[PDB]
Amino acid sequence: ELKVAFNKDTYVATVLDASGSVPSGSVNVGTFFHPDETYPDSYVIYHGVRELLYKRSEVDPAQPGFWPENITNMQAVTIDNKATARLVLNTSLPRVVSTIEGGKVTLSVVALGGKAPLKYKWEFRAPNASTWTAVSGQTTANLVLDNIDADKAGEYKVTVTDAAGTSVDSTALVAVGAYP
Amino acid sequence: MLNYNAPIDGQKSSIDGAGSDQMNTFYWLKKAIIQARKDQYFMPLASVTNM
Amino acid sequence: PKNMGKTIKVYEYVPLLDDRNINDQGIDANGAHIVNGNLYGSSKDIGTITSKLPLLTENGGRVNRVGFTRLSREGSIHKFGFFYEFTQESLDFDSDDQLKEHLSRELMNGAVQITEAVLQKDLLAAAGTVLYAGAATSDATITGEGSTPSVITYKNLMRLDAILTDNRTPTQTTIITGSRLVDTKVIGGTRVMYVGSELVPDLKAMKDLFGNKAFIEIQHYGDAGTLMNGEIGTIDKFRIIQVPEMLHWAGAGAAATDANPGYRTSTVNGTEHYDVYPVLVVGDDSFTTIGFQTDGKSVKFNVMTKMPGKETADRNDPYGETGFSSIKWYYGILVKRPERIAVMKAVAPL
Amino acid sequence: EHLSRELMNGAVQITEAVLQKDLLAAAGTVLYAGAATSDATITGEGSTPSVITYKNLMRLDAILTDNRTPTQTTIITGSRLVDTKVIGGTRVMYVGSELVPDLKAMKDLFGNKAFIEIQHYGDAGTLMNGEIGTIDKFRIIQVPEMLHWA
Amino acid sequence: FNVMTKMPGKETADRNDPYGETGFSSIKWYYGILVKRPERIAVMKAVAPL
């Protein structure tokens, strides 16, 4: 959730983080979830700010208002995002990773954004299973499966959680070729 | 034995290896089930005094 | 078509004002984000309609938003097949000389009957309106001996007609106004029922609502209207067709005791249980039988006879004295609109 | 195309819904079946449930004759066929699907059936759409979507 | 019924959206009733079975 604050005087709509600080004059215009729960990769900071201001009277942002008299000319509204960057996954686990009994496989994930402390966690689902047995001792954003055997085949998933809590995940199906 | 020409229920066929599934697993019939406009019984028995 | 899977899926476009049109997109008459987006849905309550009207002011802005949905529906194919074997001496040292033909015919007839039975089972399974005659809440509570038994009555058929009309299920026939021939009557049936051959004794004695005969036989209206084959009479709004081969659950009723007044009872694990008989009415355009490779016909059989001789020898039979003949087919239905099919489960007299 | 279709059908249905509601709310001769005198006292349990009875429809028309409500349909005097009947239906009455079963099994003043259905009078009567029959002097029309108070 | 629909493209392109990728369709109308004689409308209330 990202708290937005509007300063009619400068027509500035600073998008602070949940725990931000309404700048001098900037009246709390409301909050909204940047990664829209329903449609995450379909909306951007603007959409939220726009709607939050559509329901605020022109005469006084602080006072709510509707279509007849509200802040809708986004041309003037100056949006200044003072909120944490959206946790993204520039590099994600290699969709599929085929190897033979022995061949080392390395799953890699590069996360950018979120709160600085980007913690990592690896979970493993055996073939034909539902439980995601978390790989113990793996917080490295890089799992080297050296001398892999047939048992270590299956799906491997990461969970890049930021200090805040937002977590980006990626999975990779490791296939190990066995030999009599 | 290469078999199972249709794994709709997550039951991957023989020929398909890791990270692969049948491109088409069903047929898509064009004709869509559609409910008609509801029967009207009170608008007909009206009159218009134009304003 | 081939190389296209073993299931067929369609789309059902739910109308706007339906109680199944759930969507996040929704705005009230004041710009608020109301949860539902189907206005008032399929609600015939005055309060709901009045409260959720799409009132829009003269300086109309961004009020009154409504969304839409689409629902898929699936259906698959299942295979069948059976065969029989015959030694050469059986067809060569037999009193009859046409045994092969008299077995091929008696096998094909059986295959056709099997196809009919499986179609009947699928229709009796996929029923949107599964209605229980009498005072039964489940199949296990369909009895015939309690204070209130489970027998087909006039009120139950009236309720089935009401439910079918409400689901917007279309009529199949038209009412028959009278003739000039004396002792004839006027049937008023538009639906077509498909009772078994065991409910007819009970269905031929329902005392209306006022203790009058409520079974106008076919002879009373043959002059003034068409007669559908298999007909035995009409009841309220159901032109009745007797189906000789009518599937019936046996033992899916209640416990049977000595107070049994004479209703059919089968046996399931010792203690006898009552038998449940269906009254199936299937509406127009409710299902389709997806024929795979069956050109036009719903089911195409494949004969695979192999005469004993030089065409059946192998290491398993160096002498080659046995043959076989097999029939196999594909079958499956897609119930596009499972709201026309309706069933009354009830007991039948012994 | 389907989106626009659904939009238009929703608009038409909602418009008729408004008409239904307003006509119901603008009723001048309001009567209550059974021993009732208000909505809050309408009931279905006790000695006198609010069930439509032959007397209640008879009282309904008596008011509709004092209030000079003009008759709409004529009377079917009979046909030449065998099992047809005569009809005294003058006014047109609309019923929801819910109340139809209670009208089907409702007795006349002598303890018999008075719901002569559409199949009886078809040769003479120019049966209107949605008709299900006449009871005493009202020709009933079923309204597939008829509103109600919950 | 009055319908005004604007497809995505040049029509919806403005300065609050200089790409034109958001359409809309709206239907509006007027309605009312003049009840001249209310005594000719006779509603009756009851309870119907389940």
Residue numbers in the entry:
A (entry chain K): 3 to 182
B (entry chain H): 1 to 51
C (entry chain G): 52 to 401
D (entry chain H): 152 to 301
E (entry chain H): 352 to 401
Lines from the paper:
We describe the isolation and characterization of phages Moo19 and B2, including whole-genome sequencing and analysis, cryo–electron microscopy (cryo-EM) structure determination, mass spectrometry, host range studies, and enzymatic assays of the tail proteins. Our work shows that these phages have divergent decoration proteins and unique tail structures, and encode and package their own phage-dependent RNA polymerase, and the tails, which display esterase activity, are dependent on specific O-antigen modifications of lipopolysaccharide (LPS) for entry. Moo19 and B2 are similar to bacteriophage N4—these are all T = 9 podophages, which encapsidate their own polymerases—a hallmark of this phage family.
We also analyzed the data by imposing icosahedral symmetry to visualize the capsids at high resolution (3.6 and 3.4 Å for Moo19 and B2, respectively). The major capsid protein of each has the HK97-like fold that is present in most, if not all, dsDNA tailed phages. The decoration proteins of both Moo19 and B2 bind the capsid proteins at the same quasi-sixfold symmetry axes in both phages but have notably different folds. Moo19’s decoration protein (gp28) displays an immunoglobulin (Ig) domain–like structure that is similar to Hoc in phage T4 (39). The C-terminal portion is likely also an Ig-like domain that forms the trimer spike similar to Hoc, but the resolution of this region was too poor to accurately model.
